[PDB]
Design a protein around this ligand. Structure first.
Ligand SMILES: Nc1ncnc2c1ncn2[C@@H]1O[C@H](COP(=O)(O)OP(=O)(O)OP(=O)(O)O)[C@@H](O)[C@H]1O
Ligand SMILES: [Ca+2]
Ligand SMILES: [Ca+2]
Ligand SMILES: [Ca+2]
Lengths: 306, 371
């Protein structure tokens, strides 16, 4: 887009010559009695405004790079040139001029010939091995008891990477969560969970009104198990994250399709952790989540008293 | 307060602070998850590993790359990369810092919006901006007109740029880059009696590629020289740490860039894609393009590549054309440096998309302000 700057305002307003120097990421005017005396350690921006019959002005933008100027100075000169052109409705013709190789036109701007002098303003520029974590110390039995007791102090349940949780214990977790009022996050990554676990979790999502986050990554849930989970989504308006990636087997093209169809029938889920294989559903999913997330933005704008 | 610059690529994240001359954090753009080969009690409560730490365990984990061929295709894992970049690598609270992101040429429109949405909804940045990678490289080289060859780990683009802006109809994308080259060197090292076929081996062959490969000026000649002399051969100490030798593989590997058939791709070589890209442009700007060929990205680091490019393009171009290849020593970080300069400019304050402007417009604001 087009940008303002006190010097832009002054640019090309009449026929003549204007010289600015790049000084610490700003465009600074050169005193008119120093015109044509270029610091070889610096970078400059020159605008030649020529007048023509229309009353309209002709514009030629030159950025001059001294041999010892720093990368921030030549980059800024270049960018400021583009910005100045844009501000001038794109009508300037841009010229790169390097010390010792300046164009005849540019050299011609300087009646007495341009000079070089040494120096200038200073640049504006200013392990691990194998999993070293103590294991998940979460107590499976105790925690299940708390979810059953509807324990107010229990909001986060992380059973990640815990060895030998019976499948009936995980199914029990899902059953207890049906009536629990306090657990907002539940994850069971890499606990060897399979379809029975996912089926029970699916039923639970139809009833539970509090769970925000569900993570079942890195288990052995099939496409059928994953499908059943998302088939619960239209009966759910509280879950916002479902992470399902890295199951032991690819879900299958047909399933990916049935899945995005369900994602389009829920306006609440904001994140779906799954890398789609087919591009059709991949983009449908990305768009569905983007749609649902924009609903958050809009109600955040409306609840803004107006 | 200080702005952040994050340059996210297929293989590497480059991140740091606006106003710095170089990125402060460079790490692999990867997320690692356990293999289903038993419960890794060692992971604790973690569901995955990110960046360097996931790399350390590349033998224990299955690694996923949320950016493919320069395009973000896994938005959830990309959230992980970005969280890890802010909180672990740069140690900043993203809601205190304007953030500049980069995107690939020809980035689909929905992706730009999604990037905008995630920065504001998930990270609550106060302001952000998205800039085209190749353009930032051209700006870091002190130019508003030129044709960039950007080659990284996942993708190679030729990006012609005039008076500040890319010419999208002339952009070409070649899905051939440093990871393919690493994989190919693994192969031809295996041809002469060495075992390298993934993980601790893919990463070490990458190091071999970076340290010993080079682009031959005349390829058929270099092959003949290689047979005779031995003056080209060099050796390399493994970590284990046996010592191996390597010869014509030094330049066969990146020859693939000029001869994609070496790995069964039908595509033309990068010299030819550069040419085709210039030829899709207005006649009146082709001279400027030919005279400002700017190399960007890690796969343009091979010694010899600029000369080889100069030679190949001369043979393609009208006889009377001035041709020049620019190959800055810091071109591994050109994109990031260009972003650092841009976000530092006194005119850049008004270019940010602010939280308020996003709140009112939604993410499609990105097509109007980041342009
Ligand atoms: N000295 C070197 N010689 C040859 N190749 C190198 C050298 N240094 C880095 N590379 C390669 O460059 C790649 C990383 O570069 P870069 O950071 O430009 O890629 P990226 O931005 O992650 O990927 P892309 O631009 O493809 O999305 C790797 O494949 C790396 O091995
Ligand atoms: Ca200077
Ligand atoms: Ca112009
Ligand atoms: Ca890149």
């Amino acid at each position: 887009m087009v940008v303002e700057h006190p010097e832009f305002l002054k640019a090309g307003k009449e026929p003549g010559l204007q010289i600015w120097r790049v000084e610490k990421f700003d465009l600074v005017p050169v005193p008119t009695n120093l015109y044509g005396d270029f610091f070889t350690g610096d970078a400059y921006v020159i605008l030649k405004t020529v007048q023509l019959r229309n009353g309209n002005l002709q514009y030629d933008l030159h950025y001059w790079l001294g041999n010892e100027c720093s990368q921030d100075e030549s980059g800024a000169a270049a960018i400021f040139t583009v910005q100045l052109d844009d501000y001038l409705n794109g009508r300037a013709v841009q010229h790169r001029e390097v010390q010792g190789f300046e164009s005849a036109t540019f050299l011609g701007y300087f009646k007495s010939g341009l000079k070089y002098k040494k120096g200038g303003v200073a640049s504006g520029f200013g392990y691990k091995p194998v999993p070293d974590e103590e294991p998940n110390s979460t107590d499976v039995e105790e925690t299940l008891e708390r979810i059953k007791n509807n324990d107010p102090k229990l909001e986060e349940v992380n059973l990640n990477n815990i060895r030998n949780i019976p499948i009936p214990t995980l199914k029990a977790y899902a059953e207890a969560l049906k009536e629990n009022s306090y657990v907002k996050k539940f994850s069971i990554v890499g606990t060897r969970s399979n379809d029975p676990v996912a089926y029970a979790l699916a039923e639970m999502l139809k009833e539970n009104k509090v769970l925000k986050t569900l993570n079942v990554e890195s288990n052995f849930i099939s496409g059928a198990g994953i499908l059943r989970l998302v088939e619960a989504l239209p009966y759910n308006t509280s879950l916002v994250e479902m992470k399902i990636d890295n199951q032991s087997q690819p879900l299958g093209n047909k399933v990916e399709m049935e899945i995005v169809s369900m994602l389009e029938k829920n306006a609440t889920l904001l994140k779906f952790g799954y890398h789609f294989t087919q591009q059709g559903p991949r983009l449908r999913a990305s768009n569905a989540m983007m749609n649902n997330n924009d609903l958050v933005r809009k109600r955040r704008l409306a609840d803004l008293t107006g | 307060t200080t702005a952040l610059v994050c340059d996210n690529g297929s293989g590497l994240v480059k991140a740091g602070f606006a106003g710095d001359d170089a990125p402060r954090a460079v790490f692999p753009s990867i997320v690692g998850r356990p293999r289903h080969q038993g419960v890794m009690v060692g992971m604790g409560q973690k569901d995955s590993y990110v960046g360097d730490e996931a790399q350390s365990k590349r033998g224990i984990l299955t690694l996923k790359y949320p950016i493919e061929h320069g395009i973000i295709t896994n938005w959830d894992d990309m959230e992980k990369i970005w969280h890890h970049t802010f909180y672990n690598e740069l140690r900043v609270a993203p809601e205190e810092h304007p953030t500049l992101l980069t995107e690939a040429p020809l980035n689909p429109k929905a992706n730009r919006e999604k990037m905008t949405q995630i920065m504001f909804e998930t990270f609550n940045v106060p302001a952000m901006y998205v800039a085209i990678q190749a353009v930032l490289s051209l700006y870091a080289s002190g130019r508003t007109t030129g044709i960039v060859l950007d080659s990284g780990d996942g993708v190679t683009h030729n990006v012609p740029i005039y008076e500040g802006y890319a010419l999208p109809h002339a952009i070409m994308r070649l899905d051939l880059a440093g990871r393919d080259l690493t994989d190919y060197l693994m192969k031809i090292l295996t041809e002469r009696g060495y075992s390298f076929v993934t993980t601790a081996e893919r990463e070490i062959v990458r190091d071999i590629k970076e340290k010993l490969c080079y682009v031959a000026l005349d390829f058929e000649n270099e092959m003949a020289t290689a047979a005779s002399s031995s003056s080209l051969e060099k050796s390399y100490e493994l970590p284990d740490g046996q010592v191996i030798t390597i010869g014509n593989e030094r330049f066969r590997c990146p020859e693939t860039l000029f001869q994609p058939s070496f790995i069964g791709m039908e595509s033309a070589g990068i010299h030819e894609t550069t040419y085709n890209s210039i030829m899709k442009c207005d006649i009146d700007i082709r001279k400027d393009l030919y005279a400002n060929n700017v190399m960007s990205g890690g796969t343009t680091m091979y010694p010899g590549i600029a000369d080889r490019m100069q030679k190949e393009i001369t043979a393609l171009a009208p006889s009377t054309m001035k041709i020049k290849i620019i190959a800055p020593p810091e071109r591994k970080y050109s994109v990031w440096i260009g972003g650092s300069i841009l976000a530092s400019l006194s005119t850049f304050q008004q270019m940010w998309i602010t939280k308020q402007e996003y709140d009112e417009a939604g993410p499609s604001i990105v097509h109007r302000k980041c342009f």
